[PDB]
Symmetry: C2
Subunit: 716 residues, 2 copies
């Protein structure tokens, strides 16, 4: 009984969430009644508001699919330029259907589930005067208090129409003070938490790169001002889409707040011919009454159970060594094998050969050539790739007894250098607008994945690459945004093309571990997580800054999803030097731990082998546990996080001291998410009751500029 | 004409400040009218308030010298236990006197000036029921907008009275929003700026250590919430005292705000026999209508001209090398001359021998023995101190053509180790209370400077030490607070003793550079500064923390006063590693630049030598210039300071980037204090108008974790 229909009243009920709206059988419009904690039985209906001035009754109600141009002066969820040239729309309720389970989304990633886990309501709207239909989908995963929404615009007329704006999700909030949380950043500093009070007017963010981007993530939280990581009410929203997007919160004149996410309107002019349909990407919505952190934990469990479809969602990731920051472009066969040998002697189970291996006539010896020609470079691999992959995958891994090293490889399929062979043959494969200059970023242009030719070029050279040697890992990079485009339609057709490609290649190679990447987290979104079980979090590999970046990213996405590598010091992006154990402890909070340096530069082998076994020990709890962000880096210089097994048997605490703490008391870190009346053994020694660890806590002191502790808890 | 008297109205006028109060003919009370920017002529009087409830008229007025116990329930400026046992006091105006110049204070440090720079009004109050006189002094330095206040209480009856509380200055503000600024800290983190809204109730701070302490400085600012370093009204208050203090700011039930500073009342129980007198220390107050930075510049120029009496107040300090961090206790004759030789090799002009040189039967080889025994250790100085100091003062200074190195020494006169000959001889000289444990801090006790025996002991061993070799610099340290006291009287009696000793010694050796110290800034107050031209700012020598520490101290005291040493890395207090040029540039903001490291551990002699020459070049501006804090380290990671010559012909700009600035724009630093129409050549290259440098500014970028720039300006 997760969806309940009485009359025109639709109720979606999770475990501790409820979402209730109804159709007004006088105006035909869908009106929101409640989105929050559980309600049941009869609900109080609001007294009718007195109407004065220009704002009519339509400007005073909470709406679910608001249009503009018939009296509502607030931001709309939809804009349609009709065939006759009006931008008016009057979509009136027509009927509905409830079904158990969740239909797929055509050509797009979506959450999925079976009849027990999820129930779906589709509501049908129709415009009599313009012959346009809109179908609104609502799915409830009741276990996670999640509501997944998406919308369809179908043109049933006889001329064309243009969708000038189409929000995936559109919720109207009652009059109450709200705070908006987002993640903002840029290259080497993605996912910085920002929190601001919602003001009369518009605030929000989006992306115009054509991808979800480093600048803003397609994610935001509305909270009461008093809401913390563990107290109070939060509403999260996540767009399942890798393209441009727009997120907007508007507190209207009357005091109700409108929140909406979907396509970036400015890159959506979607012509619909008679009989065509536009399908928005899904938006996943979570409510929590247990603070922002409760909201995150439901997201994390939902994505790990009903979004990440790869067989690695719950499997542990091998500690890897990536060759980029250790060797950059300057190597050949000889060096790659040197890195692989030192890798397996240290206990690393997977070796990744990053940029620099490909191109022939135009070799990838720098930023400036070879993207597009995806065959090994004979100057560097004279007998091909397969014999080197062969010798690398015969190296035994230290401290393992049995297992041999695995090999992975870097690719950037959507891109081409002008100085390449592919570009010389197919210069029209790239994104461009007529005769305008083809602007480069890092000397490359973007391939037009809206063309089926370009799609099959990528599908084919990756199928051939993965069948040419023993490759069990692919890092799929993407190092610039879209600039000039042959039409506004191409923004979303590129993404439909990329999804066909990612869908084919990941279904075709289910045993490859695929890592997304885009100069780090430039495409860190649920859209990519559907096909890839993990994403390179950031090119910033500095211990101190990775704590801010990993904490912010975990606001929406599960730590299982985050790649994190121990790097060399002084750090190549910050120039900051941080001790080796601090750097490692930070990386162990990523689902996929690894090294990214020349192992020749690290001289304490027993320490490194000791940190790699610790990484393997904590990796199961990071993959499958629940995260409690005990102390945020934004609030203090002692950030801390707690991973609790889903069944409470075990926990691991990461606790850091960032600044020096000169001549001063240290705080107490208090845990949460334990059993108050249970006993827990802390790091094999003392034994405390759950209530003590949660209401008193532990205190750690350091006499150093940087300090860190990884502490294990066993229940009894 | 700085003091205008009209009947019972008293007006104190400065360049842009007026301070106006009057005696109420009917009540005898001194009422404040205005403490702010200039007024003249007739002043508007407040309409009379309506009285309802328990708070009578006395609780609704602005009072100059408030008592309690006659209907004013607000915090009082004085409390006297009369001979009959009452704590009541009705001091009424009897008369006044205006004089040119300014009297000194009996036994206490105080500001000074001759006729043309300062004028003084004394108001006589007298209580006829109890025979108690009180005399309030107001002095105006018109050029600096400074009012200095102090009060004597004289017992003129036939019994004893007790002064249980006596504030040095007390102002009632009208009803208006106020912010309170102070300097808080502890060892190795002195002088952190703090700012808070003033609230209904009490707020403030003080010292219970017997000295002015690292924990709070005897200083505070009242400013409007909108007030910045360069805009708005600010009222500063500074207590010229090295002992315990209390500063309280109370917003009363009616909304007037009472500010008071003076003796700590809990450490003041002063009994006056018939005819006896108590003098409070003076309180300097500065008003500025040009922001908190304008108030500091007036404090800085007033202290340099009218407080710091040493001949070094406006003399350049020689670059010095201190042995403490390079060698600690472990050395003898041979290592001291090594350090001196190497120091002269770098261009260092003054070599200071720090702790560890003294002691005989209980040698000072560590923290645990020898304080009290101020003869040179024969195990470390077999032929005495004079032969070594002779060879040291013969070393020529490199790049100086002629000058010979000077020698300095460290002493801690007010302290004794139980393991010392002094203590076995005179065990009763230490501060103690009967048979209570003599609790130690850093293995030492405090000598009771209230006893003339102790004073004459300190004068004698310092005079014999300074006459026994060619010593031109003394570092007077003091490494613990007071604990047990033979009586409450002793808190102030100690200070009167300490000041007699500092007066005697500092006038007996006017050509020694005296530098105060107390575990860094434990006695960084106007009291010491009267006798010593510079003070060791903090034991923390980390370059990043000294920015905060030095900017903070500069809120009250001039940069010519602050000692700063370039240290080695990793830092001994923080463990931080910071680049040498950064470290060096931070230390050039203090008046006495120095080195505190073993010269053999230097990565670059040529770069050190070039940095010492740069210190000698910036020093005249730091000693005599006006400080403009352009950007505060509490507000961004780009702190900046500007020293402008009094005549505006030259300026030095210090600019810092503290953390890394990864992939992000940098701010503009905008100057101030220049002539908008003059032209100024920047670092011998470009030439810009003053308005351009002030309204647009300069921009600096960095590819590193830590950046710094020292940029010189010359009028044309």
């Amino acid at each position: 009984n997760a969806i309940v229909v009485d009359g025109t009243t639709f109720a979606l009920h999770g475990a501790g969430m409820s979402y209730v709206f109804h159709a007004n059988t006088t105006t035909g419009d869908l009106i929101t009644d409640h989105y929050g904690a559980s309600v049941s039985g009869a609900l109080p209906s609001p007294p009718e508001p007195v109407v004065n001035g220009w704002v009519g009754m339509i400007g005073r109600t909470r709406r679910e699919f608001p249009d503009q141009g018939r009296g509502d002066f607030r931001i709309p969820a939809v804009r349609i330029r009709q065939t006759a040239g009006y931008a008016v729309s009057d979509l009136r309720y027509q009927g509905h259907e409830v079904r158990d389970g969740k239909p797929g989304l055509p050509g797009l990633p979506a959450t999925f589930g079976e009849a027990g886990d999820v129930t779906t309501l589709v509501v049908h709207l129709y415009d009599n005067h313009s012959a346009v239909a809109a179908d609104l989908s609502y799915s409830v995963f009741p276990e996670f208090d999640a509501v997944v929404r998406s919308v369809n615009i179908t043109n049933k007329g006889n001329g064309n129409i243009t969708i000038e704006h189409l929000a995936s999700m559109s919720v109207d909030f009652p009059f109450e003070d709200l705070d908006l949380l987002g993640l903002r950043g840029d290259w080497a500093r993605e996912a910085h938490r920002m929190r601001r009070r919602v003001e009369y007017g518009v605030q929000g963010f989006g992306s115009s790169t054509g991808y979800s981007s480093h600048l803003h993530n397609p994610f935001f939280v509305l909270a009461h001002p008093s809401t913390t990581e563990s107290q109070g009410e939060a509403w999260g929203f996540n767009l399942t889409y890798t393209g441009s997007f727009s997120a907007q919160v508007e507190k209207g004149s009357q005091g109700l707040t409108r929140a909406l996410i979907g396509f970036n309107p400015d890159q959506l002019s979607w012509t619909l011919g008679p009989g065509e349909t536009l399908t928005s990407p899904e938006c996943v919505s979570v409510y929590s009454s247990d603070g922002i952190g409760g909201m995150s934990r439901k997201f994390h469990r939902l994505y790990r159970k009903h979004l990440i479809r790869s067989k690695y969602a719950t499997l542990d990731r091998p500690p890897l060594l990536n060759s980029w920051e250790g060797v950059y472009f300057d190597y050949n066969q000889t060096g790659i094998e040197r890195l692989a040998r030192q890798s397996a002697a240290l206990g690393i189970r997977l070796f990744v050969m990053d940029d620099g291996w490909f191109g022939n006539k135009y070799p990838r010896t720098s930023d400036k050539a070879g993207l597009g020609d995806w065959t090994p470079n004979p100057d560097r691999f004279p007998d091909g790739l397969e014999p080197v992959v062969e010798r690398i995958t015969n190296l035994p891994v230290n401290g393992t007894a049995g297992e041999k090293l695995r090999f992975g490889i870097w690719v950037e399929p959507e891109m081409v250098n002008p100085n390449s062979s592919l570009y010389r043959e197919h210069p029209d494969w790239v994104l461009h607008a007529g005769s305008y200059p083809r602007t480069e970023r890092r000397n490359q242009l973007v391939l037009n994945l809206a063309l089926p030719e370009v799609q099959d070029f990528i599908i084919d050279f990756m199928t051939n690459l993965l069948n040419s040697a023993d490759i069990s890992y692919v890092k799929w990079d993407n190092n610039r945004g879209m600039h000039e485009m042959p039409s506004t339609r191409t923004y979303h057709e590129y993404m439909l093309g990329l999804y066909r490609v990612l869908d084919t290649l990941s279904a075709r190679f289910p045993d490859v571990l695929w890592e997304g990447c885009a100069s780090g987290g430039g495409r860190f979104d649920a859209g990519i997580l559907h096909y890839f079980p993990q994403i390179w979090t950031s090119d910033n590999t500095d211990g101190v800054d990775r704590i801010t970046i990993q904490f912010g990213t975990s606001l929406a996405y599960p730590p299982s999803t985050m790649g994190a590598h121990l790097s060399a010091v002084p750090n190549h992006q910050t120039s900051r030097t941080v001790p080796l154990e601090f750097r490692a402890h930070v990386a162990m909070m990523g689902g996929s731990f690894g090294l990214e340096l020349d192992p020749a530069t690290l001289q304490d082998d027993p320490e490194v082998r000791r940190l790699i076994k610790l990484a393997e020990k904590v990796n199961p709890l990071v993959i499958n546990g629940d995260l409690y962000r005990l102390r945020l880096p934004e609030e203090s210089q002692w950030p801390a996080a707690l991973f609790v097994a889903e069944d409470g048997s075990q926990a691991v605490l990461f606790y850091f001291q960032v600044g020096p703490n000169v001549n001063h008391a240290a705080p107490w870190v208090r845990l949460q998410g334990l059993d108050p009346e249970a006993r827990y053994t802390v790091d094999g020694n003392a034994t405390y009751k759950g209530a003590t660890l949660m209401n008193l806590g532990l205190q750690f002191t350091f006499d150093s500029e940087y300090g860190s502790k990884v502490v294990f808890l066993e229940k009894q």
